[PDB]
Structure 1
Amino acid sequence: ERVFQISFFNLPTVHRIRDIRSEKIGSLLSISGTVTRTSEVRPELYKASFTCDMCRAIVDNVEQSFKYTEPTFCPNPSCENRAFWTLNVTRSRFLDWQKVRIQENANEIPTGSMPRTLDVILRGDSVERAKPGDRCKFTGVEIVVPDVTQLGLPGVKPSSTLDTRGISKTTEGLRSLGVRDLTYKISFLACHVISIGSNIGERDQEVFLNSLS
């Protein structure tokens, strides 16, 4: 099956990098910025195909959303456990992936502050449409990505522990639980990349005169 990508453009407003707020996470947005770093094109696990460790039958077309996930269904009835799996990288499907870093435009930086950066990720056909040093308008979705460096930051960092209310227990003997931090940074995932001119306002001549009306 061919993967399709929907690219939206001509959004009514264009946001600065510093205008990005947490209320717009998971929402369609258009930002602008100057590209500083471009990574090389890398494969991203889209449709993972797994084999169970002890039943050893192959299953395919597993949804992959950001962090790496393994299925717990195990549809064959031969075995009885869910957690143990092994990835088949040859059989699984991948998409193009690029992490391009963008910086606030020089006219948009506030009075005394330094420019702040943002890692926007391009997937599929949008990859390699941005060059080091040009001004690009990215249309996409404001996403959120796990950050570990917020451990030393002041303030109450949210955390997640397992709720145990409907679980029966006995004090037979022979008390451990899984608690994990909720610390994140805002990132962007663009479906449309257009390069507006770095100015204020292809070697062959034929392709140039074809472009002009």
Structure 2
Amino acid sequence: VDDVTGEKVREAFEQFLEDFSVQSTDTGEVEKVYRAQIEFMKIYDLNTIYIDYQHLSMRENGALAMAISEQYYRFLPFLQKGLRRVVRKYAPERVFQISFFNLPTVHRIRDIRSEKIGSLLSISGTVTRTSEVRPELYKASFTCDMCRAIVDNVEQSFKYTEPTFCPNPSCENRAFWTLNVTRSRFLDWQKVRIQENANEIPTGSMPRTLDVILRGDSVERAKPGDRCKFTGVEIVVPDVTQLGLPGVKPSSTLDTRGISKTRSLGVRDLTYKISFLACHVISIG
């Protein structure tokens, strides 16, 4: 059902971009639009897109708009899979990245909370300390020697481990590894650390930076010593360094009340720090 409701949001969005995106008549820019975008991207075949938010917010009265904004991390997979669907339909090596822009609102970095977590948002600030571009897995072929490698999948969320199932064989496991660097897909990336805009900061609170990671062809778009405007893909990164913070800090101690006694305790603290992410980067300002 949650699968079904989410999938419904899929079909609704896919219908959106396939349904008319443009009301402009006579002289134009007459319809469509986004088809023209898929095709203009098919011109140089660089496989990433730009689609505006405002339209999408207006069309459905926003039920879809809000459905995207609030649960957006939930709704990534359905969306890029939907784009893949339409591409498969009208178009003939698959890497896709979808980035909205032109949000209705701007939020200061100091105005960031955890209620907007996992949800797309807009943040503008002064970029600082860009960092050289390094590859990333997210698709890897890794298995043991026994009995065969070339299994390619998973490592989706940042972990980075490991193969999910159907080990070894026949040694079936558990186990772990081994990872190939000869077979996998990589993308990007460069990290940049963005600072609060000099003019804004509340007295005397003094500026506080946050960290924004750049994946996508959005790479290198950022510039050191410049004001920029980002759109959300917001998320979280875990942090070891918070101890003696003070607490009270939550933990992972597992519930073993199943099974029976005849692994140990297995406790891992979970302490996260907010760090923004970016699909879209503009130099506006």
- Specify the TM-score bucket, using the shorter chain as the normaliser: 0.7 to 0.9
Structure that is richer in strand per residue = 1
1:50 and 1:67, CA in 2 relative to 1: closer, same or farther beyond 3 A? same
1:87 and 1:117, CA in 2 relative to 1: closer, same or farther beyond 3 A? same
Matched with 2:194 is 102
Partners of 2:128 and 2:224 within 8 A in 1 = yes
Partners of 1:32 and 1:138 within 8 A in 2 = yes
Q: 1:6 aligns with which of 76, 81, 98?
A: 98
Query: What is the rounded CA distance, in whole Å, between the counterparts of 1:84 and 1:74 in structure 2?
Result: 12
SS of 1:113's partner is coil
**RMSD between aligned residues:** 2.4
1:167 and 1:95, CA in 2 relative to 1: closer, same or farther beyond 3 A? same
List runs of 5+ in structure 2 lacking aligned partners: 1-92
Query: What is the rounded CA distance, in whole Å, between the counterparts of 1:155 and 1:81 in structure 2?
Result: 38
Structure 1 runs (4+) deviating above 4 angstroms are none
Q: 2:113 aligns with which of 16, 21, 46?
A: 21
Query: What is the rounded CA distance, in whole Å, between the counterparts of 2:241 and 2:202 in structure 1?
Result: 25
What are the superposed Cα offsets for residues 149-175 of structure 1, whole Å, 9 maximum, x if unpaired?
111201201111110111211xxxxx8
What are the superposed Cα offsets for residues 73-112 of structure 1, whole Å, 9 maximum, x if unpaired?
1266422112322111121111001110010001210011
Matched with 1:192 is 280
Partners of 1:138 and 1:194 within 8 A in 2 = yes
Partners of 1:34 and 1:136 within 8 A in 2 = yes
Structure that is richer in helix per residue = 2
1:115: how far off? 0.3
Partners of 2:146 and 2:169 within 8 A in 1 = no
1:189: how far off? 1.3
What are the superposed Cα offsets for residues 97-145 of structure 1, whole Å, 9 maximum, x if unpaired?
1110010001210011110011101112000011110000011222110
Structure with bigger RCO (C-alpha 8 Å, 6+ apart): 1
Partners of 1:71 and 1:82 within 8 A in 2 = no
Structure (1 or 2) with the larger CA radius of gyration:
1
1:2 and 1:72, CA in 2 relative to 1: closer, same or farther beyond 3 A? closer
Partners of 2:143 and 2:163 within 8 A in 1 = no
1:180: how far off? 0.5
1:46: how far off? 2.1
The TM-score with structure 1 as length reference comes to 0.84
Partners of 1:74 and 1:82 within 8 A in 2 = no
1:85-96 equivalences in 2 (<5 Å) = 85-96=177-188
Query: What is the rounded CA distance, in whole Å, between the counterparts of 1:14 and 1:90 in structure 2?
Result: 43
Query: What is the rounded CA distance, in whole Å, between the counterparts of 2:247 and 2:167 in structure 1?
Result: 45
1:95 and 1:162, CA in 2 relative to 1: closer, same or farther beyond 3 A? same
The TM-score with structure 2 as length reference comes to 0.64
Calculate percent identity across the aligned residue pairs.
Answer: 99
